[PDB]
Amino acid sequence: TKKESFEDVLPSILNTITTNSELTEVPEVANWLKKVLEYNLAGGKKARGLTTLFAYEMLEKPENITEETIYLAKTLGWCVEILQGFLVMLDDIMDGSTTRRGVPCWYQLPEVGLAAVNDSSLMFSSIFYVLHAHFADKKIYTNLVELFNESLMHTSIGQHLDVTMERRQKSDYSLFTIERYNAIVKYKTAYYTYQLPVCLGMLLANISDPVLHQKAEDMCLEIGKFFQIQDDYIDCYGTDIQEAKCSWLAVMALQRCSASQKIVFTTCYGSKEPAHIERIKELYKQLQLPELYAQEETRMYESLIKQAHGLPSELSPALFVRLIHMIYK
């Protein structure tokens, strides 16, 4: 039901974007941009956007939830989805990707090409037109604008930490530390899937107390951690191993390795040979990482719920409970 409710305000958004702007004197660009947005949003799960809606729907008082304020939540939600299109659009560029949701990447198309980097710039800036339309005069405006600039930085830091990981020398695993794994989930994943939508929700519902934003933050990051650890683990039991990714399993494995075992790791990780993969999966078993996951998942879940249940009523422990439950199973 809600995913159709969300896709319904899109068309309007792309008209808001092709208007209150200098684009009236350059209608050609306006139509080239529209095409970038519709393509680079099209398809996919719409989750980060929905989560932005869902958050508001739960933190605002229902007497205060109106016809209009649902439209704004769908908007902010949409701003976040543009932010994603922006990121995935340059994950491809940097990661040599060739397709995405069936169709080829936006940069693979012949008429587009490496132009794309400029198309990236255009999408992002669009966020700030929409913000100006529906929020120029409101009191939260600055915060919204700040919060979106802030976002581009977090995800850039995270992008950097990821490319810097994939540079390396194949056989050097000195950055495969839980310290650095946590920073990768913090900066690239967590923020714009959980913090950003939540935080964006709070502000529509005029929740501003600093120490409430801090408690919401802490919660989202604990959460994304919990998300990632699952995702990583499910990948093993996917291709995480043969691509030499910094999974929770790579990191833990290296903590527990004897020096001999550490060599089996460096040698066989990052390889397509079934014999090699099998070796890593075996060494994982030896190291009792499955044993360790099942304990950690439980503790993390339990302490995450208990964190929600203790939260001020302003933050809808309800909200944060569901978020956690959604990732459970």
Add this chain to the structure above:
Amino acid sequence: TKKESFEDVLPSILNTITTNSELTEVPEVANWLKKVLEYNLAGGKKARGLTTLFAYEMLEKPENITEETIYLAKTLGWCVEILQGFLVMLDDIMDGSTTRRGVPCWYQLPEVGLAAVNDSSLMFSSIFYVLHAHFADKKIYTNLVELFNESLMHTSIGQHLDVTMERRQKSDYSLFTIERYNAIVKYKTAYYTYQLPVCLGMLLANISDPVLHQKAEDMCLEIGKFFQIQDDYIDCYGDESLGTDIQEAKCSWLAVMALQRCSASQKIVFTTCYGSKEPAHIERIKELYKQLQLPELYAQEETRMYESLIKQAHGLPSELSPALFVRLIHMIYKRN
């Protein structure tokens, strides 16, 4: 000694990028940012910075020019060079370029590669860390941000017109039109070379009347339009000791003007040799420009345009400093 005055404050700016923000927790990424800044800002004229500074110094009532505001201004200058270095680093990538300001382009480096797109985004985002540092508590702030965001739009429209004009049908120059040359320069150059640095000075010196804002906007584009026609001329008839327009198949003022003046036969001669590596071909074109009398035209139009501007400058109200604008038009009239 204004350029030395400007370059002096770079270190303090870069420190402020690291410090107050999140980059405390990830030091690896703070240092990598310094490296992307120091390399992508290096060398150059430092021109837009200097204008931003100059425009402030000229606009403000001198009683209020403190040691602090001189800094504040330079800062906004540098946010502009940051915007520049960004744009160029992408304008290389998209236009398969290899070197710029004497050195290898950032993306052509060994370790970097196509990561440069990310490095770009980090670069741009630094502006907002600087803005928060020195202006968080000030009326204007909101406006500096908004403005710096528009800046990316305005520019990347500019970039789009240039990379979309020079990307399809190599023998087809039907888009080499004055109407479209001018759109290109308005958004990509005029904006961030004059329109911006001034609009930044105007803010720093609490000038607010939207009519006043307008007249400066117009002024700046007429200066930008002019600025760029010069560069386009010099890149063909430059003294080498003091350019690749013809080879890169640029929409230069000269090419646009050539194509108004061509016969059908002279048009067929243009499509043959424009955008050619050979010096055999680069000579046909410059000799054509000689037949179509573009040198004499330029020499006339340069004089007219100057005189037109100089007047428009004096016709500004004093609150916009005719002085300022008169000077910028001078700094450029006669170049090499």
